[PDB]
Design an enzyme around this catalytic site. Structure first.
Site, mmCIF file in Angstrom:
data_model
loop_
_atom_site.group_PDB
_atom_site.id
_atom_site.type_symbol
_atom_site.label_atom_id
_atom_site.label_comp_id
_atom_site.label_asym_id
_atom_site.label_seq_id
_atom_site.Cartn_x
_atom_site.Cartn_y
_atom_site.Cartn_z
ATOM 1 N N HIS A 12 4.133 11.143 5.942
ATOM 2 C CA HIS A 12 4.424 10.670 7.252
ATOM 3 C C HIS A 12 5.652 10.261 8.262
ATOM 4 O O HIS A 12 6.023 8.875 7.574
ATOM 5 C CB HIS A 12 3.147 9.759 7.579
ATOM 6 C CG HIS A 12 1.209 10.851 6.962
ATOM 7 N ND1 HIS A 12 0.552 9.311 6.149
ATOM 8 C CD2 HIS A 12 1.145 11.574 6.992
ATOM 9 C CE1 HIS A 12 -0.446 10.514 6.301
ATOM 10 N NE2 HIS A 12 0.352 11.937 5.997
ATOM 11 N N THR A 62 -4.675 6.616 9.598
ATOM 12 C CA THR A 62 -5.519 6.811 8.252
ATOM 13 C C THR A 62 -5.225 5.489 7.163
ATOM 14 O O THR A 62 -6.547 5.188 6.095
ATOM 15 C CB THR A 62 -4.894 7.616 7.146
ATOM 16 O OG1 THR A 62 -3.729 7.622 6.973
ATOM 17 C CG2 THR A 62 -4.763 8.735 8.410
ATOM 18 N N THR A 63 -4.980 3.809 7.656
ATOM 19 C CA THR A 63 -5.442 3.160 7.057
ATOM 20 C C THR A 63 -5.195 2.119 7.822
ATOM 21 O O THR A 63 -5.239 1.966 9.460
ATOM 22 C CB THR A 63 -3.543 2.146 6.736
ATOM 23 O OG1 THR A 63 -2.676 2.589 7.351
ATOM 24 C CG2 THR A 63 -4.067 3.661 5.246
ATOM 25 N N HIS A 71 0.624 -0.862 -0.225
ATOM 26 C CA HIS A 71 0.071 0.024 0.359
ATOM 27 C C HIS A 71 1.127 1.179 -0.179
ATOM 28 O O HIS A 71 0.584 2.855 -0.149
ATOM 29 C CB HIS A 71 -1.403 -0.213 1.596
ATOM 30 C CG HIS A 71 -0.587 -0.926 2.534
ATOM 31 N ND1 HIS A 71 -0.368 0.967 3.431
ATOM 32 C CD2 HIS A 71 -0.680 -1.613 3.329
ATOM 33 C CE1 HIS A 71 0.127 -0.088 4.257
ATOM 34 N NE2 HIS A 71 -0.112 -1.203 4.108
ATOM 35 N N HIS A 129 1.674 9.157 0.623
ATOM 36 C CA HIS A 129 0.760 9.103 0.221
ATOM 37 C C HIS A 129 0.830 9.649 -1.064
ATOM 38 O O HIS A 129 1.079 10.759 -0.714
ATOM 39 C CB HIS A 129 -0.477 9.158 0.530
ATOM 40 C CG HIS A 129 -0.894 8.152 2.172
ATOM 41 N ND1 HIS A 129 -1.330 7.421 2.030
ATOM 42 C CD2 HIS A 129 -0.070 8.295 3.536
ATOM 43 C CE1 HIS A 129 -1.611 6.481 3.733
ATOM 44 N NE2 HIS A 129 -1.105 7.470 4.232
ATOM 45 N N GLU A 156 -3.660 13.413 1.956
ATOM 46 C CA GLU A 156 -4.700 12.313 2.857
ATOM 47 C C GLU A 156 -5.733 14.501 3.870
ATOM 48 O O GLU A 156 -7.217 13.992 3.261
ATOM 49 C CB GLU A 156 -4.058 11.816 3.860
ATOM 50 C CG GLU A 156 -3.880 11.001 3.008
ATOM 51 C CD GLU A 156 -3.408 8.970 4.131
ATOM 52 O OE1 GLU A 156 -3.080 9.231 4.664
ATOM 53 O OE2 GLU A 156 -3.835 8.058 3.566
ATOM 54 N N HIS A 173 6.429 7.163 5.351
ATOM 55 C CA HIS A 173 6.351 6.805 4.477
ATOM 56 C C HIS A 173 4.947 7.680 3.834
ATOM 57 O O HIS A 173 4.570 8.806 4.662
ATOM 58 C CB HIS A 173 4.852 5.822 4.461
ATOM 59 C CG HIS A 173 3.886 6.003 5.216
ATOM 60 N ND1 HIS A 173 3.974 5.589 7.134
ATOM 61 C CD2 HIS A 173 2.980 6.061 5.078
ATOM 62 C CE1 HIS A 173 2.616 6.744 6.725
ATOM 63 N NE2 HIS A 173 1.696 6.786 5.683
HETATM 64 ZN ZN ZN Z 1 0.051 7.367 5.818
#
Ligand code: ZN
Length: 257
Positions: A116, A195-196, A61, A93, A103, A91
């Site tokens: 993040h 957020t996951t 992901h 997004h 996000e 990591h």
């Molecule tokens: Zn994140």
């Protein structure tokens, strides 16, 4: 099983993770008008000179750069935080196009990506215990816009081919995460979630106001990654972001006037 597909995506996560509809879900839209300055917010302290990256990995992901967190080698303090938060991983997004990927949004403005930096409260002894607590995690969120290259990103970009498909990892030492920071550390903060999945509500969010610039060539290297494992049909790892969630009861505070 969960993902960012039309079928296993953010809209369907609540099915297996019913906290997805909870009261402290992240991300959120940051409305500059309603998010008020709080002069009792202290400044951010980041001690990252002894930061010890170990590896970079593709978890299907995103890609995580992981850090030795056995000691206070790389720690976040002050700001809205009580006590010491150790950096465990960072990591990103990102989107399929420049016009999306973040996000959090700022007055509905989406950025090209969001970095993040994930830290955990040494009050609780290890990451596993920390995530079970409302004051367990601090994540430093940093927006990405496309433009000038980011020198301190290039070390990361330059290994991404080595971890194209899910499952792949590679050694990744002597990476300095100060190189991913912007010039101002003015921030917004609010209590939130992962957020996951498992979307636990264990995060003090600290979102920086100043984006970092990255180069077109840099973001395109992100977009070349694969969700799939080696051998499967290629699904490019793009649009691995969750949309803004209801803010509900919460107030977003600004460190700056
Ligand atoms: Zn994140």
């Amino acid at each position: 099983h969960w993902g960012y597909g039309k079928h296993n995506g953010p809209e369907h996560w609540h099915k297996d993770f019913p906290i997805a509809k909870g009261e402290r879900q992240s991300p959120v839209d940051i409305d500059t008008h309603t998010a008020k300055y709080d002069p009792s917010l202290k400044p951010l302290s980041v001690s990252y000179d002894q930061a010890t990256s170990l590896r970079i990995l593709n978890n299907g992901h995103a890609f995580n750069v992981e850090f030795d967190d056995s000691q206070d080698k790389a720690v976040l303090k002050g700001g809205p935080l009580d006590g010491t938060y150790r950096l465990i991983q960072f990591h990103f997004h990102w989107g399929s196009l420049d016009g999306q990927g973040s996000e959090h949004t700022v007055d509905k403005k989406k950025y090209a990506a969001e970095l993040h930096l994930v830290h955990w409260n040494t009050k609780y002894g290890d990451f596993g215990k920390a995530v079970q607590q409302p004051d367990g995690l601090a994540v430093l969120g940093i927006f990405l816009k496309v433009g000038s290259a980011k020198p301190g990103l290039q070390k990361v970009v330059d290994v991404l081919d080595s971890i194209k498909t899910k499952g792949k990892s590679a050694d990744f030492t002597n990476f300095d995460p100060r190189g991913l920071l912007p010039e101002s550390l003015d921030y917004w903060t609010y209590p939130g979630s992962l957020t996951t999945p498992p979307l636990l509500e264990c995060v003090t969010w600290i979102v920086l106001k100043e984006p970092i610039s990255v180069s077109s060539e840099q973001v395109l290297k992100f977009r070349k990654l694969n969700f799939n494992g080696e051998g499967e049909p290629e699904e490019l790892m793009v649009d691995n972001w969750r949309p803004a969630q209801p803010l509900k009861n919460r107030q977003i505070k600004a460190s700056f006037k």
